Amino acid sequence: MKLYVFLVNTGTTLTFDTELTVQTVADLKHAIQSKYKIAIQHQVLVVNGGECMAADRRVCTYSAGTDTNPIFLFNKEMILCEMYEVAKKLCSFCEGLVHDEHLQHQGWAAIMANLEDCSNSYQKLLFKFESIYSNYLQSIEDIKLKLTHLGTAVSVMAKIPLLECLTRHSFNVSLLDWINVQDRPNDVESLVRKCFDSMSRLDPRIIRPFIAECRQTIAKLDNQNMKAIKGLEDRLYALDQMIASCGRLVNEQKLQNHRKLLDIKQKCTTAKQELANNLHVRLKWCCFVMLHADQDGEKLQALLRLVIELLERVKIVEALSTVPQMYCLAVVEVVRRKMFIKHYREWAGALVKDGKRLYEAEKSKRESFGKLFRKSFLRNRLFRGLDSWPPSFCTQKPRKFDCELPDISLKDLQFLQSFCPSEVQPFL
Amino acid sequence: CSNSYQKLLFKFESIYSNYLQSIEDIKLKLTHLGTAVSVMAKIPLLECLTFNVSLLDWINVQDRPNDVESLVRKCFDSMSRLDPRIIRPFIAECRQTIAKHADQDGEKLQALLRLVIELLERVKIVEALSTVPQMYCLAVVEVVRRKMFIKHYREWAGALVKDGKRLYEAEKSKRESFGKLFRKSFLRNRLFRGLDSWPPSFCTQKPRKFDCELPDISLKDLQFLQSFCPSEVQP
Amino acid sequence: HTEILRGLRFTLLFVQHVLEIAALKGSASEAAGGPEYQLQESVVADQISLLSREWGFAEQLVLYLKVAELLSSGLQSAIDQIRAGKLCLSSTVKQVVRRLNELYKASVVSCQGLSLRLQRFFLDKQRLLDRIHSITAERLIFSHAVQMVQSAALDEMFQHREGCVPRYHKALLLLEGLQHMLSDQADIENVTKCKLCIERRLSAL
Amino acid sequence: HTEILRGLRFTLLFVQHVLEIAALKGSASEAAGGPEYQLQESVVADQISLLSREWGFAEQLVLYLKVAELLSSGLQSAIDQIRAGKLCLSSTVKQVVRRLNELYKASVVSCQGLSLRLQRFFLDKQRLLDRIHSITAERLIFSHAVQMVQSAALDEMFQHREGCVPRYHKALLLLEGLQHMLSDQADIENVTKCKLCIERRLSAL
Amino acid sequence: DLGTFYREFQNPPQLSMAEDLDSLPEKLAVHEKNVREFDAFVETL
Amino acid sequence: DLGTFYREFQNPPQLSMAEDLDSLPEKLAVHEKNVREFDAFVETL
């Protein structure tokens, strides 16, 4: 069933396809181009009750695709540019216009609704960025000294030797290159340069003026919401009085008032035209605030994303700092691991030898006992239980003393210790 | 005819002829067994009871249906059935007269041969039982040795397990310290590699129970019984 | 008319035969050719049995108690025969019952032997007698009967079946008594085997 | 033939822009920041580049080598178009070819000098180089294009509001060149996505 | 017949005792009482 | 659109060396010869 809707910019009337009526409101977005209108790229719509037309949301979930509680449409493209039967027929037009006034009220209400969400959404991010930037403002000094420490560490790493035996993991060289080796398009210098580039791009000299501009825009949006919505403050009561008078006159009609009612019907259109005047007056305040807000909106989010990312890489920037002392300690750790592997191998060998000796001797004793009496006397049944083999100790060998550890040399450790920079204490 | 079938027991008769002295030797073996039964009566049986009776007493009672006297009388009866004085001479006379429809003589000879073979097997059992006082003194020695070995093995294995536990704990502590220090710095899993391997600790564990099914004959009680039975106390 | 006494009388004849079996358990014997070459082997067996006479006498006294069970069963309120009319004009049957009562008194003497044996058992083989799980007297009686049958077969082979027929008859009566005492299912199967054996013996007659 | 001439000229412009990227790789400039830059950052980046010049020079050599390969292909195609399709021996074509030849000679000189400089460097760092997976030149070109686009967008926002059209056109040309030299559909999808994005953003003008 | 008997000899059929052993004096007293009762009873013949 | 493009461009749709180092002298000499040939071709102007 094809949809029946409203369009305030088009006299509160609209039509759409059946998919627009039942399926996701993206079908309604497509059908906006239909029914002699521009597409949703040049339109904006909301369901009765102010429900914003979410394209993904099913029109069935919207429940406004028919003339009953029909959705209203705001056209952005519009912003981009004998004879007694009349007693009811004239009144017939008025009531629809009267309902249109109510329909008109909903659109402003829906417009206000979006502003409320817009105001909330904008304000929420505002403080979020405000805190973040202030956090960043405080963090500005913190990041700086960190970068200098990173540079000093890079120099030390240059002074620091290369991997020595670890190269064979698969000559004169430094861990700095080894550090620089990984992620060839993303070297350390690239990281530092990107960080400082964001920092400069995060200039408070611009951020603060941008923040002030955003605050002024938000205040202007609030004022427009106060002003444009108030633009039709006096309409409701006057329209109600006119509609009541029209109803009473039509009822009395059952031709002195006939022209009077006809003129009153004509007089209504001027109010309707006057109503249109308030609309575009209000509508201009809407989109202009809306568009500008959207332009500022994502920017802060993008700024936040930029703010977040700068925070993000800052940690990674911080991460590389410990690498020199970390590797210096790691060398000694691997050396201790090798020594422990040696000692453990010796202990395991001694234990295995003793266990093999004892197991062999006990097996010999058991063999002698069996030779004496294995099935050699009925006394075995009565004396059952002694035929057990002796204890099964651990005469076997260990599995592996962490073989996957890479190769290293203690003399290589001494050579590195002699050759290394002041990080020798971290490896002392 | 039936003599061909009876030739099985006829061949057994030569073995019986061989056994004729062997049974007489077994008779001597039987006398030694009786002396050993008396020595087993002097010997005790209380160790690993499962009280105060003798070794020969327990052995005879070890089977309620039959005992040493039962098998001894059975052996004497078998000797009578194969009597060298008459029956064995009678058996040989029958074997000769076989050459003088032969179902009866063949069946009798085969049954007698089966009985004699059973008698020889029982004699072997008797000989094993006559060894059984020696085998009992030996089994007591073996049980005491097993107790000593179990004690020594328990001590050694426990010391080994404790030392291995101490070593594994110390290594795990050092490894945990090293891992905690820069648990995820400088791409330790990438820059270095394999340091995360926890040191092996299989040697730390202790062995399970072994030789638990021992009849729990006390070694000191074994020595007491050995001293109380000097007669053939050597085994 | 005389069942309440005659059944107990057959049971008591079986008891007397069991007493004879116990007596045989008291001392060894030789037959089927008599003593053999180196009959000291039989004398050796006698020496061993003397060394072990305690267990044999104990088995005999256990059998005596097992029979004394039914003996006391008859003795306690023994007017069942009269109530069945067995004793009606049968004072001689009552005298036979009194003879069976003197037999129960002999069983009491054997039970005194049993008391001495049990005292000696608590002295030596106390825990053994505790874990004895030994064969009931019925199994021992059946084993003695089977040994008698085997001796009878050996004698029949030895062409001395003159008295072996009487031995077969006595063993058949023993089998009948055991069947009267055949409480267990395995006892019933063994009694069927003994019936087949008695049929074979009658065939050998 | 002038269409082939335009294709050659597009190759030429892509080559020139790639050479500019290579030069920037030789030495980085922070003047693109706009308003200002912390002096320490300049000092820190200076120290870093001084420490890592060798590997940076190596990346420069790889880029220049890719440029040279492009130039050699263009020269072979130039010999081909000389064989047929000279298009009246267009003086414009002659000047384009001469500029290309001068660039090629510059590329050869640069490659020779870079190789001479890296001789000891390539010598000492042989083991890691063997370990190291090569840094694809096309990857470097894409990275320069992406960073340029990102900086241009940041300037578009945050009220720089200048030079955006020039940098945008330049990056569009660079992306088109990369796509022409892409020859791998997997990332060619992403390349086409970026090109379409640039074209769509070009609607701002 | 004889062969069957020999086979039966070759393979005869087949079929904690402190539980019965301990009750020996009690059963002895019970049997003594029953014997005395029957001794009195036998005079009724 | 262009303002919206930043989100898309914010994400990187991203794309043994000693082997290349070996071919360096060969490619260099090949380039030198090609340079001589190309200069000769240029002389045709």
Numbering used by the authors:
A (entry chain A): 1 to 81, 124 to 212, 304 to 387, 424 to 597
B (entry chain B): 160 to 209, 304 to 353, 461 to 595
C (entry chain D), D (entry chain C): 840 to 1044
E (entry chain F), F (entry chain E): 462 to 476, 487 to 516
Manuscript excerpt for this entry:
The unc-51-like kinase protein kinase complex (ULK1C) and the class III phosphatidylinositol (PI) 3-kinase complex I (PI3KC3-C1) are the most upstream and central players in the initiation of macroautophagy. FIP200 is the central scaffolding subunit of the ULK1 complex (ULK1C), which also contains the ULK1 (or ULK2) kinase itself, ATG13, and ATG101. PI3KC3-C1 contains one copy each of the lipid kinase VPS34, the pseudokinase VPS15, and the regulatory subunits BECN1 and ATG14. The two complexes coassemble through extensive contacts between the FIP200 scaffold subunit of ULK1C and the VPS15 pseudokinase subunit of PI3KC3-C1.
Three potential binding sites (#1(370-387), #2(392-398), #3(409-414)) on the opposite side of the ULK1^MIT^ binding and one (#4(449-460)) on the same side of ULK1^MIT^ were identified ([Fig fig2]), consistent with previous hydrogen-deuterium exchange-mass spectrometry (HDX-MS) and site-directed mutagenesis data. The supercomplex structure showed that the N-terminus of the BECN1 and ATG14L binds near ATG13 sites #1-3 on FIP200. The interaction with site #2 is asymmetric and we therefore hypothesized that its main role is to inhibit 2:2:2 ULK1C formation. We hypothesized that PI3KC3-C1 acts by displacing the ATG13 from site #2, and potentially, sites #1 and 3. To test this model, we truncated ATG13^MR^ at residue 450 and determined the structure of the ATG13^1′1–450^ ULK1C core by cryo-EM in the absence of PI3KC3-C1. The 2D averages clearly show densities ULK1^MIT^-ATG13^MIM^ heterodimer on both sides of the shoulder ([Fig fig5]), which was confirmed by 3D reconstruction at 4.46 Å ([Fig figs2]). This demonstrated that ATG13^MR^ has an inhibitory function on recruitment of the second ULK1 kinase to the FIP200 dimer, which is relieved upon formation of the supercomplex with PI3KC3-C1.
